[PDB]
Paper text:
After 3D refinement and local refinement on the central portion along the filament axis (150 Å long), we generated a final density map at 3.7 Å resolution, as estimated by gold-standard Fourier shell correlation (FSC). The resolution, which is close to 3.3 Å in the central portion of the filament, decreases to 4.3 Å towards the edges, especially towards both ends. This made it impossible to precisely calculate the helical symmetry operators for the filament, which could nevertheless be estimated at 11 Å in rise and 93° in twist angle. As PilE1 and PilE2, which could not be distinguished within the final density map, share high sequence identity, we arbitrarily chose PilE1 to produce an atomic model of S. sanguinis T4P. In our atomic model, the pilin subunits display a canonical lollipop structure in which the α1N portion of a 52 residues-long α1 helix protrudes from a globular head. In the globular head, α1C is packed against a three-strand β-sheet, which is flanked at its N- and C-termini by two regions with limited secondary structure elements, a large αβ-loop and a short CT tail, respectively. Critically, as in other structures of bacterial T4F11, a portion of α1N is melted, the extent of which varies slightly between Ile16 and Gln28 in the different chains. The superposition of the structures of the complete pilins that we were able to resolve, shows that the α1N up to the end of the melted region are intrinsically flexible, emanating at different angles from the globular heads, which in contrast remain almost unchanged, aligning with 1.3 Å root-mean-square deviation (RMSD) globally. The filaments are right-handed with four pilins per turn, displaying approx. 11 Å rise and 93° twist between consecutive subunits within the 1-start helix. Perhaps the most unusual interaction is within the right-handed 1-start helix, where the CT tail in PilE1 (mostly negatively charged) engages the next pilin αβ-loop (mostly positively charged) through electrostatic interactions. At the level of the left-handed 3-start, the melted region in subunit S is held in a groove between α1N of subunit S+3, and α1C of subunit S−3.
Type 4 pili (T4P) are important virulence factors, which belong to a superfamily of nanomachines ubiquitous in prokaryotes, called type 4 filaments (T4F). T4F are defined as helical polymers of type 4 pilins. S. sanguinis T4P have been characterised in depth, revealing that they are heteropolymers of two major pilins (PilE1, PilE2)—which is unusual—and three minor pilins (PilA, PilB, PilC). Our 3.7 Å resolution cryo-EM structure of S. sanguinis heteropolymeric T4P and the resulting full atomic model including all minor pilins highlight universal features of bacterial T4F and have widespread implications in understanding T4F biology.
Numbering used by the authors:
A (entry chain E): 16 to 92, 100 to 138
B (entry chain I), F (entry chain A), H (entry chain B): 1 to 92, 100 to 137
C (entry chain C): 1 to 92, 100 to 138
D (entry chain H): 2 to 92, 100 to 138
E (entry chain F): 1 to 91, 101 to 134
G (entry chain D): 10 to 92, 100 to 139
I (entry chain G): 1 to 54, 64 to 92, 100 to 137
Amino acid sequence: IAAVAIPAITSFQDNARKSRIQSEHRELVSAIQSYIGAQDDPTNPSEITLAKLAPYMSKNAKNEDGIVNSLAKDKSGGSAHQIDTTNHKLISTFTPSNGGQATVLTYDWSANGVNS
Amino acid sequence: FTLVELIVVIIIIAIIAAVAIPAITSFQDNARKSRIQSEHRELVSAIQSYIGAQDDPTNPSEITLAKLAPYMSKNAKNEDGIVNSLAKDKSGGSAHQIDTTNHKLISTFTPSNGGQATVLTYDWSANGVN
Amino acid sequence: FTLVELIVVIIIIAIIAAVAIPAITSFQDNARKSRIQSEHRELVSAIQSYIGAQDDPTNPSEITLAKLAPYMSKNAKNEDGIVNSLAKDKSGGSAHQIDTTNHKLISTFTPSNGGQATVLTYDWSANGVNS
Amino acid sequence: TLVELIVVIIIIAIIAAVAIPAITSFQDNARKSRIQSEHRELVSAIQSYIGAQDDPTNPSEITLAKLAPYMSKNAKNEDGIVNSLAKDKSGGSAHQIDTTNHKLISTFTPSNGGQATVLTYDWSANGVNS
Amino acid sequence: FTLVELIVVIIIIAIIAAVAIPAITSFQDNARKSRIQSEHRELVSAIQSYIGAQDDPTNPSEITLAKLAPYMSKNAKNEDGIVNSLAKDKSSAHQIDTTNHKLISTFTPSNGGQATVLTYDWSAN
Amino acid sequence: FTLVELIVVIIIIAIIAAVAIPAITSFQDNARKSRIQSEHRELVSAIQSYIGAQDDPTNPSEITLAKLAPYMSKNAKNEDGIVNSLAKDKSGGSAHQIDTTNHKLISTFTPSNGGQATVLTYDWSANGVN
Amino acid sequence: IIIIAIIAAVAIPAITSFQDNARKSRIQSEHRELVSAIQSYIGAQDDPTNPSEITLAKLAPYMSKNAKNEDGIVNSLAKDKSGGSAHQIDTTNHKLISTFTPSNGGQATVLTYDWSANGVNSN
Amino acid sequence: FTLVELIVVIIIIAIIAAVAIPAITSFQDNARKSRIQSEHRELVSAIQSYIGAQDDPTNPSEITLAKLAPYMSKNAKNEDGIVNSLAKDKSGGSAHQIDTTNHKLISTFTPSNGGQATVLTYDWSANGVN
Amino acid sequence: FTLVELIVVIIIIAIIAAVAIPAITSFQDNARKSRIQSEHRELVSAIQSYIGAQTLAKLAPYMSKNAKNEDGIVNSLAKDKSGGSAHQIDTTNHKLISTFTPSNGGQATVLTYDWSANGVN
């Protein structure tokens, strides 16, 4: 009875965090769509940046004062989301604790498309 | 054996609930701007038809959007006349205006956030030259 | 995805559907009146040429637009009656008539709203000239 | 291990008691949005058809069977528009023509039995002066 | 559709509605310029015909459009004053000088450009 | 959780997304029908100006539209043959045809749904009147 | 220790039975976007009334890369797990077909769209 | 809530998030294409009128759009130069340009993805067909 | 409106703008043709009258001056496209010639008259 194995918590923890990042990314990808839809000339995208995308997203459950307190946090192998403002790309990263290979999501609105 | 399972549940329930929530009404406003800009060209088409149906198109008479009335299909329900149908813009009583004395049609729109106004003009005589 | 976005979809549709819609009917009367006047000039040219073809141009016999038939091509649908080529007066059907006993051609138009009518006159008798 | 085995029962008893939500939500009021756009669709079709015969001022008597070849088949490859326009109470199309009055009526009625809604279009009469 | 189609349908309108508007009355007045010339030709033929009326075609008398009126028909309105059946301009668009046997037609456009002149003489050349 | 997936994942998306689709073909017919007529009238004006140039306007030797070619300007993209400029209908490839035996010019059109045809004719023969 | 044999008796829900209503949804909502793409493309070329030889490899510029940044369109659409796109173009028929089959082997469902000579022609 | 239930909530999200995303820009430039095709036919109407209004229409002089300016109205912002009204393209920035010596009007359109260009052309100076 | 609706106007405009248009110059020179063929008979009647009265410079007083008071008939007679009078005389040949050349580079057309040696075989 003493020999029964005990599983580690971190294995279930990390694989849930991997779901959180993957949800928030898919919300930001339509928030930014609304911003480009509503900039004063929507036909010519201009200098999107995360701090100015803020008013489309609700406060955290503590009613704190900025979305860096709401969007998720990661090692980024610290904000789990970043904008490459001059290159017009959004990137979201999940880094495992165990040394497994990292997962990076991406979105890209500057006329690149699939080109294939 | 089960207690580890239960505390695992208690952790994951905590961390998946933190997901951020979008804000309602955020994009809603600029549809009205789209209505204004699409309805302006429709009034330009109407006024440019009336200007051709009068007897002396070389020397046109006055216009007001009351005389312009019989072109706008009565607003999808029992309603009296076109002022009931053209977009409202209470913050800036009718979105459409005619300077009946100086032959100028103007449409205007203004966000609530204090950004600068949108204005559109059409001016149907002796204009266009540099 | 989540509820809020799918609510704003409904709101945007409810707004965008409320653009006004233009009427079907406009500007028809001047189009009819223009064909009337241009066709009138063509009938005046036809009858003026016909007077030169009788055995004595100074004293022609009776003229009727049924006699004037061989000057006008068939209708574009290949129907052959001259009256099926000329415009219709929708007050009631040719908008053109000949006062055969008094040498006068008359082309009439009546506005669709019932306003004031307009008439064009021509005659080939000597009474067509004055000092 | 009897201590943890004891408290496992307590944790189960607590976790099982959570409030369980119910299914309905917007599934009613979303259908009204199908109606609002499918109406403007039929108005665009009928406003094309009314101009195709040789006299746009004396059109023939429209029935939606004559309008039908403007609509695509249902995605399930059904064979007629009544299997495509939104259904309503038996009375089953929410849209009908009553050609003797020259009007198209589109309808809605909520499950709570509240105030019903009507959208009307008319190709005979339109807004009066003033 | 989902939201993206509804932002595309807003983006598209802003660049359909911008198509430029052509003016009105840009080309109106040159129809007067043309019908002035055709009426000039017809009046020239009429005054030429007039020389055959009196007993001696080698010694014709004075002429005015009042004398010449018997040679062309009443108005399409069936009114009969030829001073309104001729073309009209800032001035009758046509003139006769009994003292020089000269017939003149003239047209001046509203844009302030150069005036245009036509002339005929049945007496000497 | 599961049910607030369920509703948006199935119910509301199924209700909102499956509105009826307009048919992309049937709206084209009036545009084709119009451009046919406009080209017909301009071809008549051209041939009616070709006859008046001949050395013997009582007997123009023959007319086929290759001879008529230089009276209309070359199309956009500069595909400089006349047949490249006129309307097409493989079921009529020109939609206009010249009969050299009967001196007759013909135009023809047919709606894609298999409706009744329309035909136009012009004829400069002595058989072409009354 | 006997109590553990009772505590262990709880039945396990089978994950496969919860998938169908999700895949069905991301077939329907994807089909409607491919149709909107086709219905735009058919108006872009120089002859609005004679189609080109449409195939989805030429629709490709109308929708984004995968989140994995793999390019090409076929990597992006939903997969028929029986075998690989769940969306097919039958070029000869001008017909688009989309297919779904439940894992337990129930009756199939197909969506369809067709952009030539395809008015209903009621009764 | 039990773990074997709680993980399917993860699975459903992992499926439903992975829809395709439509690319805005490829829909946008299909509209800019239809500006070019409309504005070109307006410039043809203007230049074909101006050749008719000159002092001797058989002997037209050089043309520039600056000379052509008064024939179409100034833009909705009451900006006062023709060049601001006409559409813009990277092949410029005006998409429309006139060859003063070869008497040719050229409109060019460049796809945003760097694909194959498209050009429209008109030529009033006696070039004709065949 | 929605895209399914909105793109059909793009279709319709793309169709309506394709209508062909007539060539201006191909009427205009076939008009000029008529003043050549007609004024040829005016010159013939004048010079035939002159040879009964007992180069076009000698003929000049026999015909009316232009409506804009040009200085002589050489400015009233029509203009040759080739290279300027479209009419010429040669008193070494007793011959009058008139010519028209089309703008397309197609077949040129020539009239002739002589006050001697009419008639054949």
